Scaffold this active site. Sequence first.
Site, PDB file in Angstrom:
ATOM      1  N   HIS A  19      -1.883   2.036  16.990  1.00 23.41           N
ATOM      2  CA  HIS A  19      -1.350   2.661  15.750  1.00 23.41           C
ATOM      3  C   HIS A  19      -0.070   3.446  15.938  1.00 23.41           C
ATOM      4  O   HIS A  19       0.118   4.499  15.336  1.00 23.41           O
ATOM      5  CB  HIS A  19      -2.441   3.443  14.968  1.00 23.41           C
TER       6      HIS A  19
ATOM      7  N   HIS B  56      -2.923  -9.367  10.114  1.00 17.67           N
ATOM      8  CA  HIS B  56      -3.510  -8.168   9.544  1.00 17.67           C
ATOM      9  C   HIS B  56      -4.370  -8.552   8.343  1.00 17.67           C
ATOM     10  O   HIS B  56      -4.082  -9.545   7.631  1.00 17.67           O
ATOM     11  CB  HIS B  56      -2.294  -7.281   9.169  1.00 17.67           C
TER      12      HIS B  56
ATOM     13  N   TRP C 218       2.242   7.552  12.151  1.00 13.70           N
ATOM     14  CA  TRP C 218       0.849   7.418  11.778  1.00 13.70           C
ATOM     15  C   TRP C 218       0.365   6.049  12.101  1.00 13.70           C
ATOM     16  O   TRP C 218       1.049   5.053  11.855  1.00 13.70           O
ATOM     17  CB  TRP C 218       0.598   7.792  10.278  1.00 13.70           C
TER      18      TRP C 218
ATOM     19  N   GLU D 173      -8.006 -10.800  11.013  1.00 14.11           N
ATOM     20  CA  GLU D 173      -8.679  -9.518  10.750  1.00 14.11           C
ATOM     21  C   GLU D 173      -9.458  -9.604   9.448  1.00 14.11           C
ATOM     22  O   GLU D 173      -8.966 -10.151   8.453  1.00 14.11           O
ATOM     23  CB  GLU D 173      -7.620  -8.423  10.678  1.00 14.11           C
TER      24      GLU D 173
ATOM     25  N   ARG E 272     -12.920  -4.614  16.617  1.00 12.53           N
ATOM     26  CA  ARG E 272     -11.919  -3.563  16.879  1.00 12.53           C
ATOM     27  C   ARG E 272     -12.613  -2.240  17.020  1.00 12.53           C
ATOM     28  O   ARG E 272     -13.365  -1.813  16.118  1.00 12.53           O
ATOM     29  CB  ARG E 272     -10.955  -3.508  15.703  1.00 12.53           C
TER      30      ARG E 272
ATOM     31  N   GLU F   3       2.018  -5.953  11.874  1.00 14.09           N
ATOM     32  CA  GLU F   3       1.541  -5.837  10.478  1.00 14.09           C
ATOM     33  C   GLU F   3       2.582  -5.196   9.583  1.00 14.09           C
ATOM     34  O   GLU F   3       2.551  -5.434   8.357  1.00 14.09           O
ATOM     35  CB  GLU F   3       0.226  -5.049  10.409  1.00 14.09           C
TER      36      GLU F   3
ATOM     37  N   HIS G 203     -14.274  -4.055  12.088  1.00 14.48           N
ATOM     38  CA  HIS G 203     -14.005  -2.705  12.584  1.00 14.48           C
ATOM     39  C   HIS G 203     -15.282  -1.973  12.937  1.00 14.48           C
ATOM     40  O   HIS G 203     -16.241  -1.974  12.139  1.00 14.48           O
ATOM     41  CB  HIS G 203     -13.255  -1.896  11.509  1.00 14.48           C
TER      42      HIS G 203
ATOM     43  N   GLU H 211      -2.979  -3.316  20.229  1.00 13.88           N
ATOM     44  CA  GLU H 211      -2.097  -3.554  19.066  1.00 13.88           C
ATOM     45  C   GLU H 211      -1.225  -2.364  18.723  1.00 13.88           C
ATOM     46  O   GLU H 211      -1.646  -1.204  18.851  1.00 13.88           O
ATOM     47  CB  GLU H 211      -3.027  -3.841  17.869  1.00 13.88           C
TER      48      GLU H 211
ATOM     49  N   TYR I  49      -6.569   7.663  14.073  1.00 13.11           N
ATOM     50  CA  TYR I  49      -6.494   6.443  13.288  1.00 13.11           C
ATOM     51  C   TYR I  49      -7.750   5.588  13.372  1.00 13.11           C
ATOM     52  O   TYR I  49      -8.244   5.279  14.475  1.00 13.11           O
ATOM     53  CB  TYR I  49      -5.323   5.552  13.704  1.00 13.11           C
TER      54      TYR I  49
ATOM     55  N   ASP J  45      -6.473  -0.769  18.334  1.00  9.96           N
ATOM     56  CA  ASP J  45      -5.223  -0.535  17.633  1.00  9.96           C
ATOM     57  C   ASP J  45      -4.699   0.868  18.017  1.00  9.96           C
ATOM     58  O   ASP J  45      -5.312   1.889  17.713  1.00  9.96           O
ATOM     59  CB  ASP J  45      -5.510  -0.651  16.127  1.00  9.96           C
TER      60      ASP J  45
ATOM     61  N   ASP K 217      -6.131  -3.398   1.916  1.00 10.33           N
ATOM     62  CA  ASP K 217      -4.945  -3.300   1.042  1.00 10.33           C
ATOM     63  C   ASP K 217      -4.211  -4.608   0.885  1.00 10.33           C
ATOM     64  O   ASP K 217      -3.221  -4.645   0.150  1.00 10.33           O
ATOM     65  CB  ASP K 217      -3.979  -2.156   1.484  1.00 10.33           C
TER      66      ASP K 217
ATOM     67  N   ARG L  59       1.239 -10.239  14.099  1.00  9.91           N
ATOM     68  CA  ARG L  59       0.277  -9.743  13.088  1.00  9.91           C
ATOM     69  C   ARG L  59       0.827  -9.747  11.662  1.00  9.91           C
ATOM     70  O   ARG L  59       0.080  -9.473  10.713  1.00  9.91           O
ATOM     71  CB  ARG L  59      -0.041  -8.266  13.420  1.00  9.91           C
TER      72      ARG L  59
ATOM     73  N   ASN M 191       0.825  -1.218   0.000  1.00 11.93           N
ATOM     74  CA  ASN M 191       0.000   0.000   0.000  1.00 11.93           C
ATOM     75  C   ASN M 191       0.847   1.251   0.000  1.00 11.93           C
ATOM     76  O   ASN M 191       1.694   1.437   0.893  1.00 11.93           O
ATOM     77  CB  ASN M 191      -0.903  -0.027   1.240  1.00 11.93           C
TER      78      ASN M 191
END
Lengths: 397, 397, 397, 397
Positions: free
Chosen positions: C207, C307, C397, C334, C147, C257, C122, C231, C159, C205, C311, C278, C37
């Site tokens: 993130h 994960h 991010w 996931e 999640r 991930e 999610h 996570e 996020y 998460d 993507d 993950r 991605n």
Amino acid sequence: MKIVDAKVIVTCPGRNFVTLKIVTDQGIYGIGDATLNGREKSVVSYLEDYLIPVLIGRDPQQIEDIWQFFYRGAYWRRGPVGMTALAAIDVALWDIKAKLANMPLYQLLGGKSRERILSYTHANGKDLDSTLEAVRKAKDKGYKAIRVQCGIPGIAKTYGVSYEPADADLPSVEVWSTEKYLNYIPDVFAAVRKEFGPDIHLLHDVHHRLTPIEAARLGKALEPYHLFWMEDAVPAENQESFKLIRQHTTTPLAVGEVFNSIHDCRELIQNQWIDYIRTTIVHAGGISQMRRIADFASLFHVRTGFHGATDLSPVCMGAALHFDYWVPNFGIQEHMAHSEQMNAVFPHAYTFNDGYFTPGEKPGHGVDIDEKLAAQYPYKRACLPVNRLEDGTLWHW
Amino acid sequence: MKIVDAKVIVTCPGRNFVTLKIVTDQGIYGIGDATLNGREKSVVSYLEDYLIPVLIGRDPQQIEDIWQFFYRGAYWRRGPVGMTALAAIDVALWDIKAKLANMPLYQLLGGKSRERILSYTHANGKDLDSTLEAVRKAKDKGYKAIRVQCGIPGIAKTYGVSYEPADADLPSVEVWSTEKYLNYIPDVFAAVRKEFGPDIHLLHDVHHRLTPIEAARLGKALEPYHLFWMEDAVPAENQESFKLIRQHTTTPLAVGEVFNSIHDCRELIQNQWIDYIRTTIVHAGGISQMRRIADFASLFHVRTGFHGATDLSPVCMGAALHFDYWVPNFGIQEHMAHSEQMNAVFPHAYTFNDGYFTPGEKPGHGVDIDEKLAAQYPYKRACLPVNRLEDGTLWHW
Amino acid sequence: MKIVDAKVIVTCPGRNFVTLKIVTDQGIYGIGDATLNGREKSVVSYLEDYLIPVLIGRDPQQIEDIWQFFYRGAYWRRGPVGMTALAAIDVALWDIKAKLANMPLYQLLGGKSRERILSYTHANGKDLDSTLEAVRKAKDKGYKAIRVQCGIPGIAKTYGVSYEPADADLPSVEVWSTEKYLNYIPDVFAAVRKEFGPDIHLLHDVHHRLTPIEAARLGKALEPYHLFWMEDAVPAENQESFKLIRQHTTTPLAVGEVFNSIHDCRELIQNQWIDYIRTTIVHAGGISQMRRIADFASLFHVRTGFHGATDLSPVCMGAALHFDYWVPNFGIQEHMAHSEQMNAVFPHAYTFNDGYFTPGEKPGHGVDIDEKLAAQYPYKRACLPVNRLEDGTLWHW
Amino acid sequence: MKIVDAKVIVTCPGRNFVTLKIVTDQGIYGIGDATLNGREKSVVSYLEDYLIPVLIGRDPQQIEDIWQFFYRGAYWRRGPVGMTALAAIDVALWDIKAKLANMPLYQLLGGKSRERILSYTHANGKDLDSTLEAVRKAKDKGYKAIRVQCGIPGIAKTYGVSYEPADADLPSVEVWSTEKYLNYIPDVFAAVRKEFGPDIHLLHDVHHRLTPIEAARLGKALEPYHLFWMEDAVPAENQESFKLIRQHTTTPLAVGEVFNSIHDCRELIQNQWIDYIRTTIVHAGGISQMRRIADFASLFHVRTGFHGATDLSPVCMGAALHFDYWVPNFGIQEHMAHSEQMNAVFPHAYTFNDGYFTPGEKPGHGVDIDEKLAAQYPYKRACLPVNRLEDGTLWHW
Ligand SMILES: [Cl-]
Ligand SMILES: [Cl-]
Ligand SMILES: [Mg+2]
Ligand SMILES: [Mg+2]
Ligand SMILES: [Mg+2]
Ligand SMILES: [Mg+2]
């Protein structure tokens, strides 16, 4: 390019500051802070009697060679006096290099990483009601982060309670009780959070007074109040002292205003025993060493939290703010404000707005020294206090 | 100040080189090497299709912000392709900053720490007599340090035996025997010391082929010949592999031409398992990351030993020599010479004399690219070899 | 048996997917996901310009030799681009081997270990009331694990709050405050447990946004709500970062991930610092490497938690579900659902029922690609966001 | 009892010495060495401008309180300048306490543990034949232990080759090659053992010049010659540097003439990485701190090996010999002899006979200062050399 002269300027516009000025053969000059609170003249001798005579004739562009020459060449390495003298030289040479480049110093370091620099101020009260009032006044000045210190019942004088700790020709003697402090201080933070809510950042300086398991206890007691940091909880010559604190609390930890070398904090940082390193440009060998400390710190999640008491001159503050503007792992900048009389001796480009600084766009670190005005204020000795326990034991101030 | 254009130039004046050029709105430009031997076009896409479109319009003075933006912002962090693309950007931005300062790049980093930069060359022979002749020729060229590689009896082709390893449209397949090599190579070093004496510095590249206890054995066997280093003795994805080698030999150890991040070598360095870090500006995120790796290394006695094979372009070599001129803990610079055809595409200020380099006094890193001449030499695929054991096992080349 | 052709198909049926197809001389073919991605074309070049030309003529049955040939033979090892290219090859070869065996892929790996595969979905809201509504909708779709991500007061964008993070031609810039998040997020989990009770599995998460002692604080604050995992709490290039989190909380931890190699997580796993790994088939070298990671993980109680964002194409999802059906130490899969337009390009045998998957009984991984339909949707650049702190600092991010 | 005056006496009877004299109200006085070679006036200021004004009026019997008051009360702790100033005070107060007791100082410490104190002298030559002659002369003077230093072929000037290293108004610049030294120095020890046999104790000072694996190599090469110690092999700010040396050789190790605190050597000692601690009374806070260092050392088999160069005055030598007479884990005392002109300024009770000292039976440490004679010799600046590598790098002298 050659250094043609270098001199040490000593002035006391409200408190003592020592400044090195290095002058090159093309008339560019640079300045660096050399102030070592309560031992100032020892650095003046270190520079005047030993280091300046070696500088003369050297190419000022050779910052790294000159740094290593003095750091290794003294033979007796590290230490507050020699590392503050070397800091003054290093900062004055970076000031010159940035002037020669026609750039503000932060551009030479790698450019800006942020648009503004968070600071914190001090709120001190003799009791809880006065502490809450001092927090209100600090917030009213635009600060988003506030160090809170409060007088403790049954203790006459305690650290951080306008406060200027070098208050006497010879050291004042404070008295201390650890157990009275540990029983009371969490209540101060509960009352500050009740009045001011969760968004304001709160800091506390323990000022060296605890043993590790006492600091573990205090950190746990302060967790509900989610402090930005708990600072200098135990004396840190034995860096393993922080391992036990880290075992027991998630209150973030800061240390290191008294350090002068990366070797004073390597183990604290690589073992992830602290969150913020407080060691300064003026006391630890200048920008050259502090870039290395901050970069080392970044591998271990540690952020910079430079000490910023009034005994670091505006020359240190300008260098620190340029460093703060660039460094990726910036945490916060302490700001204990200089007085108007102090500021007038050191014209500077850095500015404050709504709790934050920017370093200024002037070339160099943006700070100068008015020599004619500095000369109006002769040195006046002032030493830091000592601290004794209730039985007389000489303790950590 | 803004970046107005950036482009990737691909040329093959004898072998492939990829170069980024960043152009600012005041016509100053900078260049950086982006060459990743045997995977070159993947970096060309990484830059053209993803990173360059973000650069346009940015203030090139923001080196640190741009570095972090790409390092963190890719999301999938580190890795040869992304870190070589980021190196090209970082070097081109330091080239611009030094041009804007009107200084050679080493002055921005902190100035010179030495007057000349030691290099080493390659001496390769198919057998011992030819190896000794190659050492004589290397010494006759003025080199004071020589990497010695020799063909091994019973093995057709071995590493480092004009050698240019990316020798084919698809990978050549070499064959290898560890036991034949370990039995023979110490005799080569005994014969080199007998003929050439103790003063010449001798290096050997093991090229990834051993297990740790085999490297321990080899290091011990080479101790009488006091090598400058034994390099890349075992694959280093598991950094603990070096602890066992370090346990057993005092032959100095080097590793890391294949790394792209400080996180590939943090444990090797902080545990004092190596003596020289070989990771390069072009393959590990540029000057910004390599300053941090070298500074980290200095706390643990580790010195820089940059890889310097012909697949690092003259743009990398100029940046590396400016870095080498400043960095305190410099060890040595590899020099596998570029050909005349290669050099003509990249005019440069660095020069060689009697075994040593200086970076040159031109502003920036002192290297440029002749775009019209580069355009005469289209890309031609060339991949690195693979290595198989005698039974066919795909091994480490 | 020989590979006679291999090609890279790029399509954007709502977002970009890259797929490798390998064709053998007996007309059997296999496919593998190659999507990275926000850097997609760099993998397309890695495959087209370097790896595919080597594949042609090789016996596709030699999965292990081909894996080692590319993993070691690149010379510059590991990394997102090269390991995603190698994953595409590896999966396409396992797809071929299972077709040649006339078996669904999970049978080749060792057969099924379970009758159904738990997934999570999610639930995202801009505020708490909307978050609770999203949890209700997720439960209504039959999910037994959810999640939960919620907008934070005083923060514009955070996020995970239909969400598709690669939302722009160039990176969007989000703004972040750690302290606002830490003060608020536990209240979200308290409200979810009050409304929905203890039986539903809840995931969060983080993130990448915290430091270790902040993640320790958050894990402790979330313990009353007994999350399935917390996570990606801190960036994990320095794997020792998790030791401090593990010291302080019993909230289960997941990470990985973004990893591409076992060497990114060996220390996390062998020291029991995490509960779920993950790392995915598409981003870490395919089934061959992920079997080794999962088996290593099983010695230390660590379970797989692949994960499963959009993507990762349906080709990755089919390979992951066959892997999930066999692997003993399965934890969860996931599932961020693909759109109808995406699904139509990739006919597949896996199916969902009441919160669980089965991989399907078709030979191979059961996924194909409709080339004629894929050709209707040309590539369109989309990059992932970056995240800045409130002062502008480029953050994680 | 009160201190009524204290003064700093500076004299240069051949080289600079700084001495503190403390006078009590009953006319007893004490003296302590304050000499810090090449930085002397910084200690004169530290004492005159900061510490002496606090001493006046204090009860001199309070040695421990005064030590802690200055050690902690400076705030900026440790360091060469402050710890040498504190050493001068501490020794002068122990001198007073022993005078008040009417006892030689060693009786106050716990009495004598031996009847004589082994010393070593220096033998230095520009080449091997001259080195052997210097060893003969040292033996002829009655020494049973000899530090051997020899000029190295291809190196102009090297450490320890009448030698007085502070040889110039500004630092002399020496040049150094590690590899030339490592190749040659073992041959010097082979030749000394061949001529003089196994009974004489031989010492060598590496003088900071190696990296740990180079020191490991040298220690191994020197094992056949069974040295009493190999000293200062690597700079020791990172104390873990000695772990690698200790791994590889059984040549005994000494370090620490440059240290000023127990915190500079705690890890070296408790991990058994060294055999002799060289830290001195004058440079590390006096008898109070050195009793603690020696006692700590004794738990780990480490023995005292005080530095004894001419820049430690006869006042330091008298205090050191009284300490040496008592301490259980005594190893050896360095003796670089003072000149007649130096000795005349400092009348003393210690004496030398056939390689050994006794401290003398006078009360106190047995040393005094002739103030009228000291006044004949004004200060004259002399700094220690620096050392550069052959390329110019500023190295460790
Ligand atoms: Cl000091
Ligand atoms: Cl990559
Ligand atoms: Mg403080
Ligand atoms: Mg190599
Ligand atoms: Mg995630
Ligand atoms: Mg010595």
